[PDB]
Structures are given as structure tokens and as C-alpha cells.
């Protein structure tokens, strides 16, 4: 509570200034996702240290990405569409070839040690039984083990999948910079001088058959009830390397539709492009 009051007196959100300094609101408001395209950012993820609120900041460090920023090189070589001047994708974990220890897993190890200290302090403050407390610690170290056991499958296998999916043709936007503190998606719109503009990214409330809601709980099956071909060592599944064509063709098809789809509108609006006009008076300054 005390650290909380010190944190939230600063503000629930902040805005990066044109000069680059953060400017916290000084207000305690609930976040809405309408704010996601706004100038504001959630303040938990500012990574700006604050006196007397060090515990909150240190806990907030645990949300830091462990990935890397791969440039989408094959997509450039293929001349695929890319909204950015320098296309890039944040790939969540590095391949960990040949190492006895897995860095993605060791990070989760330190994270869990921190949570152990935190849940320990909360446990002793609430005078709860030693039994349940050690049971919490036991479940934590179990999560640690499960995490190593699948960490191999994520870092050395899912990562190559992310690395190729980054180069697919229709994956045109940059997804994330790896900096929660400052990232906001580039916000293009289709402006017209004689109309109202359409943002490409909008909170328009179309749900795309539920694709927009995010069940974070999905992590539990991942850590705890799924097999992976690498995780399975010792049976050997042999990795699948899917034919490009099946997605490539799909991309083409889409790109081919939405290409010509706008043509008649484009042609007429080309014709009438010079046709808007302003009323003007012409005063005569001299005789005849």
C-alpha cells in the first residue's frame, strides 16, 4: 500500500514529450484500451525508478522481454510489402544451441526467486501457516522445472517459426520494438482533404470472431499440458518443415484480390481528383 501510494501519486499513465522526457499524469485512473492509440502509456511499464516505490519497479522489471529484434531480411529480398522503412520483428526468444544451460529458462529462474521473496513477505505479514507457505514455494520450483523442460522447445524451435513467419508477405507491420516503456504502433490513416480520415488501426469493436480478446491463461497449458517435438527428445518425432507454397499462394491470392479490388474507385477518383473547387471573387483593379 505505501509504495502504491507513492507510485500512483505520480500518475497511472505518462506521455513521452517531444523533448523525450516522460510526463506522468499525477492522476489515478483506470486504463482503457481506447488509450492504447492515445499519447498515454501505462505507468507500471515506464521503467522510471521512483523513490520509495522500488519494490513495484523491481517487480515490474520481471515483465521485460527476453527476445531480440530480427530484421525481416528474406521479406526484403523478396520485395514483400512492409509499412516500415526498416522492417523488423521482435522474436521472443533466442535460439540456445549447444548450451548446457538455457538463458530463457534461467531468467524465469531469477523471476521465480523474486516472486518467492515477495510471496514470502506477504505470507509472513499475514501470519499464514508454514505448511502452505512452503507449498507455495514448492509449486514455484515445480514451475521452474517445467519451464526448463519446455524452454528447449520454445527457444530452439518456436523461435525459428517466428523467424520465418516474420518474412511472410502479408505480415507487413512492425510488431514490437522490445521496449514496453516507449513502444507505440506507427499509426497510419487514409486521409482525404475533402472528407474524414480512416485510421488503419482503430478500436472499432469488430472482434473478428473473437480474435481480439486475449486469454492470458493460455500460458498454463503451454507450461504444463503440452508436448513438443523437441521436448520429446527418447522418442524422435523429426521436425516438420512445411511447404512454402500453401501460405505463399494464399498470400498471393489475397494480395491479388485487394490489389484490383479498389481499381474502379481509384480510376474515377483519379479523374475527379482535380475537380474540387473553391468559390472566389475577382475584383477588377483597372478600367477595361
Amino acid at each position: 500500500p505505501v509504495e502504491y501510494g507513492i507510485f500512483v501519486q505520480r500518475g497511472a499513465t505518462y506521455t513521452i514529450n517531444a523533448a523525450g522526457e516522460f510526463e506522468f499524469s499525477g492522476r489515478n485512473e483506470k486504463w482503457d484500451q481506447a488509450l492504447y492509440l492515445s499519447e498515454h502509456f501505462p505507468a507500471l511499464f515506464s521503467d522510471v525508478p521512483l523513490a520509495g516505490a522500488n519494490t513495484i519497479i523491481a517487480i515490474m522489471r520481471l515483465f521485460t522481454p527476453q527476445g531480440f529484434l530480427r530484421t525481416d531480411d528474406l521479406a526484403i529480398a523478396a520485395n514483400f510489402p512492409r509499412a516500415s522503412r526498416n522492417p523488423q520483428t521482435y522474436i521472443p526468444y533466442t535460439n540456445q544451441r549447444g548450451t548446457v544451460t538455457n538463458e530463457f529458462a534461467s531468467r524465469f529462474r531469477t523471476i521465480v526467486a523474486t516472486l518467492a521473496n515477495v510471496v514470502n513477505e506477504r505470507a509472513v505479514q499475514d501470519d499464514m501457516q508454514k505448511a502452505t507457505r512452503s507449498c507455495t514455494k514448492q509449486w514455484l520450483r515445480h514451475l521452474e522445472t517445467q519451464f526448463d523442460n519446455i524452454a528447449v522447445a520454445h527457444t530452439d524451435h518456436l523461435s525459428v517459426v517466428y523467424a520465418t513467419m516474420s518474412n511472410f508477405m502479408l505480415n507487413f507491420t512492425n510488431n514490437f520494438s522490445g521496449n514496453h516503456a516507449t513502444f507505440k504502433p506507427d499509426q497510419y490513416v487514409i486521409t482525404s482533404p475533402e472528407g474524414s480520415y480512416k485510421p488503419i488501426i482503430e478500436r472499432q469493436g469488430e472482434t473478428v470472431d473473437g480474435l481480439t480478446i486475449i486469454d492470458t491463461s493460455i500460458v498454463w497449458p503451454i507450461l504444463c499440458q503440452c508436448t513438443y517435438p523437441l521436448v520429446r527428445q527418447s522418442i524422435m518425432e523429426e521436425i516438420v518443415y512445411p511447404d512454402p507454397s500453401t501460405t505463399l499462394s494464399q498470400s498471393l491470392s489475397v494480395a491479388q484480390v485487394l490489389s484490383k479490388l479498389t481499381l474502379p474507385d481509384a480510376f474515377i477518383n483519379m479523374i475527379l481528383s482535380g475537380g474540387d473547387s473553391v468559390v472566389m471573387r475577382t475584383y477588377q483593379t483597372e478600367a477595361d
Binding site: 517531444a18 523525450g20 523513490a51 522500488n54 549447444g98 548450451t99 534461467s106 516503456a181
Partner: protein
């Protein structure tokens, strides 16, 4: 000294170790040592731990395994306090033992070790292709030619570049890095040009003018803000470096142009690039604030984007439109040439314009860091003004400026116990004089004394005046900080007056330490306490002058005749605790125990006697003058009969009361009472209350009656004022050259842009004006300025309104103060007594001068720095003849003031006095122009010459100030003279050389012999009140004691023709 002198070197390459040093680079054997291996610091205000490794480890990527170490758990372990050095060292050491970089040691002496790639590989735990290359072929890290060290990993891996994450310098923070450094395989200048060109086709990238290991590297930023902070820090680095290069000092710059070059960035970074390349004068002057560097930098660009200068504007614009080009001065460029000469294959940024810098003459004053500026405003300046707009000053919060009533008096403790004497002068008391003085005393009693004097006496209380000092002695004694002092010493008495508990020495010159857990309450004191103590000290100094111990003799007694709680009796009783057998008792009509309660005169049955008495009787009841007179008479009578050394108070010390007291003592059978008037420094500075000192002596006292005594003049000259007292205003509107302001002080704030104008206007009134901003962020500048009557009397002589506005604008914005702490101004500032006497004499002479008709000019000989300017009316011309006066021909011509600037000759024939002129000789006759003392016969001689010289004149008026001899008789017997002295029979006021004094009788006799009209006048109480009310001055205690006896013995001869 135009050409730069510098030794550029790849410092980063020098940091990389030989392969053989890599094994021991951790120094596994020994603990890391502070200031050599590491640099820990805890900022308690920020509560932020900061560790920073030295040597090669200053560049060190950490594996998550390395971040799992307890060392990094430490800052969380100690949220509010410094990590104890033992834990810091042990964890830092065990973690150092934890690290082992891959290497292949070799015997070649040309070899180095690629520290960056090795620590990086280790940090990624050798998973990256570089980490693979290193884990399989560690020898690849070793290198001769620095560039090849990377070419070797570029060829072997087949990649065009490697993206190395940057390191945070403070190993504790785990925050995501702002950017990262890509490293390119571009051995040739051509390959570099191509990479730079392609880099200008992509978002958020920048690079240095030159690169380490001669290998091209580019920074890629995660956001615009990260790019801005980076460019800013680099601009500061380049500006500091160039600031050093331009001083002609040799520099070990690692690179000639430290600042970054955008290849692609937003508007704002292009602005930073532009003002960065400009090297604006404003940086050197510290006009910018570095607390929020980039912000100021952006603002600076905003000025340059629309700069008043054409050259600087077009230059900034041109730099903004070609951000990719690296603008640099010719003097940098020659250094780049020397670098390319020493290393023919050095790479440096190819797109580069060479501009000649634009000079600017405006030397701004500035100083970030605490301290208000105390300006001394000039009366005039190069700037002219015409109908300046009124300048409103803002309301100030008490968070910034508080306005206490009276300045507390800092002083030495001994100074509190001083007193001055005034011996009787008249040998007889004629009956007609008795009727005159009685009529005077009755008329003066029936109508109350001056209301202004009452206001000052009731505002400047001595108790508050002493309070900060008396408490301070208590605060030190409470902490045990006090130690050594003599038994009878005044410091000891001050200690007894500061604490309620009994004190005791453990030995000579050493007070006993406080018992544990004991914190005794401060002694309770009323307003008359310190005064009563000082009167006791006075009696101790009167029984024998040479004494240092102030303890009462054993088997002796004292009485404090006026009493209530009378704390002084308790303090005195405790001060003398170590002396055997001593009565000490108060005895008021309102007295509470210990003091006996009793009326005076004493009841005929009761027996009261003592070796000393200190009466302080004062009837609160309003009463007839005859009853007040009979009561005070009976009180002095019983006080004198009861003791050999009475120290009676006299509430209304008219000549009549005191002389009636002397006559009454004359009437007592068989004893002859020597007497002297007295005034201690612990009295309220403005009180006219005086203590007569009665003692018996075997001889009859020649000259026992008083006439025109100083202490008496302090009271008798005061009379009911025609006007209401001048209450000190706080002014908030600075009108341009208005002359309407009542005494008080300007106080408020303005936007810092308007500040130079404000100082430009208040020069008309205030002589000097403290100013300050509260913080670097808040633009308002606070300003306080007491109104000087002398500055008004100077500035308003003519309608011209010149000022040094052009200079004051050199202050904005950093050049006029910074102070976070709240400041405390007083409505009544302290001034030394001599200064007060000066202002009093000025009020006397000025009031005297305004009365005279038809005088063309005031000639103030020996006028120094126009000190007498307050006296002269704004209409008539002023003249100075002090050799020491500085000449200001513009100020003189503009303000109607001639200055002779020559030593005035006192010979009568050489002298030429104009008719219709007022000749001031205020304290000039007593000194030679060179400052050596002139012997008194020469002073009476020169006064005689000024007298004879003006005999021919039709209308002329001299004012010759001098020092009367009687004061040396009185100061020899007094104690309260911290300023005035008596070195071998001569007065020694202030820092001035000792100077012999004239006798008034011989002077007046000589003037009667000359036959010129003369009138020996001295400033009185109303002049004092006018001085203090006008200048905003509180008198102060030593001043209150010494001012009566000092003022009376600086007669002002008034020659008139």
C-alpha cells in the same frame, strides 16, 4: 592560439587487453578495491544504488545467469540505505570469480583481445553465431590490426553486420537499453559510403563522425525519445570538448567531433543536430539549463530558427536541411587532416561541410547553483528611458519570502552587559532655571511623549532582540558542546541566564557535563531580565573598574527593589552559588517568593539594608505629575539611604526630576552623594528610561547638577509629533521615475524576461536589490529592494532616466539568482550606530536647510561618495570637494552635481566662499585628506579660518561638525562601546584613526571672539525617529546604549551670515 592542439587516439582499442592479461583480468586472487576495480555510490535522496565497474569491465554485457547472482539482488535487499561495503565487496568478488572469458594466449606482442566480442559471446552464453565462432575458435578474438579483428568474424560468418546490445554503465539497473550498436563489414571507404547511403533510407539510425577499431558502427534506436537523449548527451560532450579546444589546451580527445550524425531521424533530432553543430555562445555562458538538457537544446534551436542574426539563422537553417552532412569548423577540420595523415586508411564520415563560425558580442552573465544576487544598482547608465510602463510585481507566497518585523541582533555575549555613563556638569541650580525646567517637565509629562518613539520602543523589544542568542547558549549547553569559561566571567552569567538548572564547575574553567537523560528547561525571562543582569554588572564595574570576575564578594548583599517573579534574582542567586553567605532578594509591591512583597518607602518598623540596590520601580497607574514626582523622589531617597551603591530607575528623566533628586540628596544630613546617569545595553534601544547611580563620597561633589545632559536630551527633545508614525509599506508596483514612494520596500516577482527592466527602474529608489529565481524550472524571478532616501535624493534632482538596462539584460536568464530555501527579509534592518548618527545629523541639517530662503547651492566639502546628498533639496545645485570622490562626468552632467575633486584649502585668503551658499563640513575638519589625524589645535585653527573667511559674505551658512572633549571623560568610565573607543585620550570611531577632540567652551569663546553668528545644535530624538522611519532601520542595543552619549558629543556648529 587559433590552431587546435590535440592527441586523438582510439581509447576504446587501448582499453582492450593483451590475450595474456585476460586470464587474470578478473583478478581472481584478490578482492575488488573501491575506486580502482569498482565505484559504488548510494544517493539517499533518490534512494538509488549505483555500482560501476572500472577497467575493461566498464564495457560488459551480462548473461541472465550473471544477472541471477545475489550481487544484483542487493539493491532490492537494501531499499533505503547504502549496501554495507563488506557485502558489496564479497558479492562483487564472488561474481568476479564467476566470470571467465574465452581466450588463446599467445607470444606475439602486437596482439590484443577483442573484449567486446568475447564478453558478448559470454553474455549470450555462446548461442549467437559470434558466440559459436568464439566457442570454437577463441583465437579469432586476438588481433594485430584493430579493424581486422572484426573483418575476421565478418568473413567467417558471412554476415554483413552484427547487432551488439549496449551496456548500461550502472550494473545495477536492468532496464531495457535505449538503442544498440550495429557493426558493419566495411573495410574500405567506399563500402562505408555505401552503407551510410543505405542507412539514410531507413528509420531511426545515427553514427559518429569516426569509429573505433576503424570499423563502421551505427546506432539503432528503439524510439525517437531514446535518439533524442542520446544526441543530447553527445552534444554536451562535443561542446565541452570544443570549449576546451578553443582554450588552446592540449586534449586527449578520443575523437575530434564527439557529436552524433543523424542518417535518418525525426524533426527534433535534426534540430539537435543543427544547434549542436553550431556551437552556440549560449552554452559557454551557461545560459542553458542542463537539468533537462535536450529540452533547452530544442528551445535553443527555436531561437536560432528565427534568430535576430541573419547569418546564424541562415546557418542553422542550412544545417537543418542537410542533417546528414557533418558540419564542422575549419579548426576541427585541420585535426581531421592530421588524423588522416597519421593513419592513411582511417575511416571518417565523408559528407562534411566546413563553415566559418559567426562571432557574437553578447557576454551573458550566468550561474546555475544556489545563491541570490545582491545587485548594487547604478544611478545612471548608457541606456535612455522615455515613459517606461509601470512594472507590476507579483504576489509572493510565504513559501518563498517571509517579512519579519525586526532583524534580530547578532552580537557577542559580553556586548550585552555594557553601559554608558553621563556625569553631571553644572555647579549650581538657579531658581529661574528651576521654574523653567519644571514648566518643561510638567508640559512634557502632561502631554505624552512622541507616538513614533512609542511605536519603535514597543516594536523593537530587547527581549526578542536577544532571544536568538540566549537560546543558542541554551542549545549548545543542552548538547554538551559548551565547555570552558571562567567563574566570574560574563559568558558564565549568560549561561545562568540561559538555563534553569544550577550549574557547577568540575574544576577551574570547566563546567560539569550533564547527567544522562537530563535536558533542563531554558530559563524563563521577561523583558527586563537581561537589563537587570546588566545593571548588576554595571554596579560590579562601578565598585572597581578593573574587575573581571563578577561574583559578589562573600558577606555582602544586593536588592532588586522592583520585583515580581523577577527571574534575574534567581539567575543571580544561581550565578553566585559558589560564593559563601550572600543575600540576594527582590522586593516589589507585586513581589512573589523568593522576593518579599513590600511597598516603598519601607515600613518604619522593617529593617532593609544592602551593599547594592537595583531599583526598577514603575507605577503602571496613570497619575498626577506631583504624585509621580513625590513618589520617584521618595524612591530615590529610600534607595540611597538603604545602600552605598543604589542604581535607581528614572522613568521620566527630565532635567527637573534629576536635579530635584540631586537637591534632595543634598538635603540629607552629613553625607555627600556622588552621582552619574547610566544606560545599559540590555535596555530597549529606544527607551528614554535612565538609571541614576547614587554613591556616597567624603568630598563634596563639584558640578553636581545636570544641564543639557545626553540621557536627558533623549527624553526631553522627544515631544508629541504633528504626524502619524510612518508605517513601512511593501511596494508592488515599480513606476518609472515617479518619486511617490513612502518608505518601505519593493518585494515581488516578474517574468525573467522583464527582470532587466525592473532592475532598470528600481534603481531610481532602492540603492541595492537582492534577486533570485526559486528553481531552474520556474521562470519568475523574485526581487527584494529596500527604498533608500539617499538614492531618491540623488536620482530625482533631474528628469533624466538613464540606467544600465543594457547590462542588466546580460543577466537573463541564469544571471540573476537561484535559491530553493525560503528567504527572510526584515522591515527594520540593522545598521551600526555611527551610520545612524550620520542619518540623524542629515535629518537635522536637511530640516535646517529646507527652512532657509534664496540659496543657490550646497557646497559639501569632504563629501566622499555623495554621502551628504540626502541633505540637499532636489532643486538647488550640489557640490563636492572631497579628493577621494570618484569622477562620473556623465552622472554629474545628468544629475546636476559639480565635483571639485581636490583637497579643500583651509587657509582663509586662498578660500573663496560664494554668497547664498550652504557649506557642509560634516566630520571633515577632524581628519587630513590622506586620513591621518589632525591635532586639535589645527582643527580649532581651521574652524577659525572658515569663520573668518565667511565674515565678508552676505548670505552663507557653515555646518562644522566636530567632537567635544567631554565624551572622552565619559567613555573612559563606560563599557558599552564596541565601535567607539578611547586610544590614549583620542576618539577612535569605527575604523578611523584616533583623533583628538575640541572643547566646546573654547570653541564658542573663539566664535564670540570672531563675532560671527553661531549656534551649536545637535540632532535630537525626532531626527532619530525620522532617520529610522525613512531608512527602515532598527537601532539595536549597543546603539541604544551609546547613541545618547555619542550624539550629544558630536556638536554641529552652525555659522551664519
Amino acid at each position: 592560439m587559433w590552431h587546435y592542439t590535440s592527441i586523438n587516439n582510439d581509447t576504446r582499442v587501448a582499453l582492450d587487453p593483451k590475450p595474456n592479461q585476460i586470464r587474470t583480468i578478473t583478478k581472481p586472487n584478490t578482492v575488488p578495491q573501491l575506486g580502482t576495480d569498482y565505484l559504488y555510490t548510494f544517493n539517499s535522496q533518490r534512494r538509488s544504488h549505483t555500482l560501476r565497474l572500472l577497467g575493461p569491465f566498464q564495457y560488459f554485457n551480462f548473461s541472465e545467469t550473471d544477472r541471477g547472482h545475489p550481487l544484483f539482488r542487493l539493491p532490492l535487499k537494501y531499499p533505503s540505505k547504502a549496501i554495507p561495503a563488506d557485502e558489496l565487496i564479497d558479492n562483487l568478488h564472488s561474481w568476479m570469480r564467476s566470470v571467465h572469458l574465452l581466450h588463446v594466449r599467445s607470444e606475439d606482442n602486437t596482439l590484443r583481445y577483442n573484449w567486446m566480442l568475447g564478453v558478448y559471446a559470454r553474455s549470450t552464453n555462446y548461442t549467437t553465431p559470434v558466440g559459436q565462432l568464439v566457442v570454437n575458435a577463441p583465437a579469432i578474438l586476438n588481433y594485430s590490426n584493430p579493424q581486422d579483428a572484426f573483418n575476421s568474424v565478418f568473413v567467417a560468418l558471412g554476415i554483413d553486420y552484427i547487432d551488439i546490445p549496449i551496456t548500461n554503465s550502472n550494473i545495477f539497473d536492468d532496464s531495457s537499453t535505449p538503442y544498440n550498436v550495429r557493426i558493419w563489414h566495411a573495410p574500405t571507404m567506399t563500402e562505408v559510403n555505401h552503407i551510410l547511403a543505405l542507412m539514410r533510407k531507413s528509420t531511426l539510425v545515427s553514427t559518429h563522425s569516426s569509429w573505433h577499431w576503424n570499423v563502421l558502427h551505427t546506432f539503432h534506436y528503439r524510439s525517437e525519445s531514446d535518439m533524442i537523449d542520446h544526441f543530447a548527451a553527445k552534444i554536451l560532450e562535443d561542446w565541452r570538448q570544443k570549449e576546451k579546444l578553443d582554450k588552446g589546451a592540449l586534449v586527449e580527445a578520443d575523437r575530434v567531433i564527439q557529436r552524433l550524425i543523424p542518417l535518418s531521424s525525426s524533426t527534433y533530432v535534426q534540430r539537435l543536430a543543427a544547434i549542436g553543430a553550431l556551437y552556440p555562445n549560449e552554452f559557454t555562458e551557461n545560459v542553458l539549463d542542463l537539468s533537462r538538457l535536450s529540452t533547452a537544446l530544442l528551445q535553443l534551436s527555436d531561437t536560432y530558427y528565427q534568430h535576430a542574426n541573419d547569418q546564424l539563422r541562415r546557418l542553422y537553417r542550412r544545417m537543418y536541411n542537410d542533417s546528414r552532412t557533418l558540419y564542422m569548423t575549419q579548426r576541427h577540420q585541420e585535426l581531421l587532416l592530421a588524423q588522416i595523415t597519421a593513419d592513411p586508411n582511417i575511416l571518417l564520415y565523408p559528407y562534411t561541410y566546413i563553415f566559418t563560425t559567426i562571432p557574437t558580442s553578447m557576454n551573458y552573465i550566468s550561474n546555475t547553483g544556489q545563491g541570490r544576487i545582491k545587485h548594487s544598482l547604478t544611478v545612471t547608465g548608457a541606456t535612455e528611458h522615455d515613459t517606461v510602463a509601470d512594472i507590476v510585481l507579483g504576489q509572493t507566497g510565504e513559501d518563498v519570502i517571509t517579512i519579519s518585523m525586526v532583524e534580530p541582533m547578532s552580537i557577542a555575549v559580553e556586548d550585552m552587559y555594557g553601559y554608558v555613563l553621563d556625569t553631571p556638569t553644572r555647579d549650581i541650580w538657579p531658581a529661574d532655571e528651576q521654574i523653567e525646567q519644571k514648566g518643561d517637565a510638567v508640559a512634557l509629562y502632561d502631554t505624552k511623549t512622541s507616538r513614533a518613539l512609542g511605536m519603535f520602543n514597543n516594536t523593537v523589544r530587547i527581549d526578542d532582540l536577544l532571544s536568538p542568542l540566549l537560546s543558542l547558549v541554551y542549545r549548545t549547553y543542552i548538547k554538551g558542546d559548551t565547555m570552558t569559561m571562567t567563574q566570574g566571567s560574563l559568558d558564565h552569567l549568560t549561561l545562568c541566564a540561559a538555563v534553569d538548572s544550577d550549574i557547577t564547575f568540575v574544576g577551574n574553567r570547566m563546567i560539569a557535563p550533564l547527567p544522562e537523560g537530563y535536558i533542563p528547561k531554558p530559563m524563563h525571562r521577561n523583558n527586563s531580565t537581561m537589563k537587570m543582569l546588566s545593571l548588576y554588572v554595571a554596579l560590579k564595574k562601578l565598585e572597581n573598574f578593573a574587575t573581571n570576575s563578577y561574583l559578589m564578594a562573600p558577606d555582602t548583599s544586593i536588592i532588586l527593589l522592583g520585583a515580581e517573579r523577577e527571574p534575574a534574582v534567581n539567575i543571580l542567586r544561581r550565578f553566585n552559588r559558589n560564593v559563601s553567605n550572600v543575600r540576594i532578594i527582590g522586593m516589589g509591591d507585586r513581589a512573589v517568593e523568593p522576593n518579599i512583597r513590600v511597598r516603598v518607602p519601607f515600613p518604619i518598623d522593617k529593617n532593609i539594608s544592602a551593599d547594592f540596590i537595583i531599583c526598577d520601580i514603575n507605577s503602571y497607574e496613570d497619575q498626577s505629575f506631583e504624585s509621580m514626582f513625590s513618589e520617584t523622589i521618595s524612591v530615590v531617597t529610600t534607595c540611597a539611604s538603604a545602600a552605598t551603591r543604589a542604581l535607581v530607575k528614572i522613568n521620566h528623566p527630565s532635567e527637573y526630576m534629576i536635579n530635584s533628586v540631586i537637591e534632595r540628596l543634598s538635603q540629607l544630613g552629613g553625607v555627600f552623594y556622588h552621582t552619574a546617569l547610566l544606560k545599559t545595553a540590555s535596555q530597549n534601544p529606544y527607551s528614554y528610561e535612565t538609571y541614576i547611580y547614587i554613591t556616597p563620597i567624603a568630598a563634596a561633589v563639584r558640578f553636581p547638577f545636570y544641564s543639557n545632559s545626553a540621557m536627558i536630551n533623549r527624553y526631553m527633545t522627544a515631544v508629541a509629533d504633528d504626524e502619524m508614525p510612518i508605517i513601512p509599506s511593501i511596494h508592488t508596483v515599480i513606476k518609472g521615475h515617479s518619486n511617490t514612494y513612502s518608505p518601505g520596500l519593493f518585494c515581488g516577482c516578474v517574468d525573467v524576461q522583464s527582470a532587466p527592466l525592473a532592475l532598470s527602474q528600481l534603481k531610481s529608489y532602492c540603492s541595492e536589490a537582492t534577486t533570485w529565481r526559486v528553481d531552474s524550472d520556474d521562470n519568475l524571478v523574485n526581487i527584494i529592494a529596500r527604498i533608500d532616501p539617499a538614492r531618491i535624493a540623488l536620482e530625482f534632482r533631474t528628469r533624466s532616466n538613464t540606467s544600465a538596462y543594457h547590462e542588466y539584460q546580460r543577466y537573463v536568464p541564469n544571471g540573476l539568482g537561484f535559491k530553493v530555501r525560503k528567504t527572510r527579509e526584515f522591515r527594520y534592518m540593522h545598521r551600526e550606530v555611527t551610520f545612524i548618527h550620520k542619518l540623524m545629523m542629515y535629518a537635522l541639517i536637511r530640516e535646517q536647510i529646507s527652512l532657509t530662503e534664496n540659496m543657490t547651492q550646497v557646497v559639501s566639502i569632504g563629501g566622499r561618495n555623495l554621502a551628504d546628498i540626502s541633505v540637499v533639496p532636489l532643486n538647488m545645485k550640489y557640490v563636492v570637494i572631497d579628493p577621494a570622490t570618484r569622477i562620473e562626468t556623465l552622472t554629474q552632467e545628468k544629475k546636476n552635481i559639480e565635483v571639485q575633486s581636490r583637497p579643500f584649502q583651509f587657509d582663509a585668503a586662498n578660500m573663496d566662499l560664494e554668497n547664498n551658499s550652504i557649506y557642509l563640513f560634516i566630520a571633515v575638519i577632524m581628519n587630513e585628506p590622506n586620513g591621518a589625524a589632525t591635532p586639535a589645535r589645527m582643527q580649532m585653527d581651521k574652524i577659525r579660518n572658515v569663520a573668518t573667511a565667511m565674515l565678508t559674505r552676505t548670505n552663507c551658512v557653515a555646518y562644522i561638525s566636530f567632537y567635544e572633549a567631554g565624551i572622552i571623560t565619559r567613555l573612559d568610565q563606560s563599557t558599552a562601546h564596541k565601535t567607539i573607543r578611547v586610544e590614549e585620550g583620542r576618539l577612535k570611531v569605527a575604523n578611523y584613526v584616533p583623533v583628538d577632540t575640541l572643547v566646546e567652551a573654547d570653541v564658542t569663546l573663539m566664535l564670540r571672539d570672531i563675532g560671527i553668528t553661531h549656534e551649536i545644535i545637535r540632532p535630537s530624538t525626532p531626527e532619530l525617529i525620522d532617520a529610522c522611519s525613512n531608512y527602515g532601520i532598527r537601532l539595536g542595543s549597543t546603539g541604544g546604549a551609546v547613541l545618547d552619549v555619542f550624539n550629544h558629543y558630536s556638536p554641529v556648529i552652525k555659522l551664519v551670515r
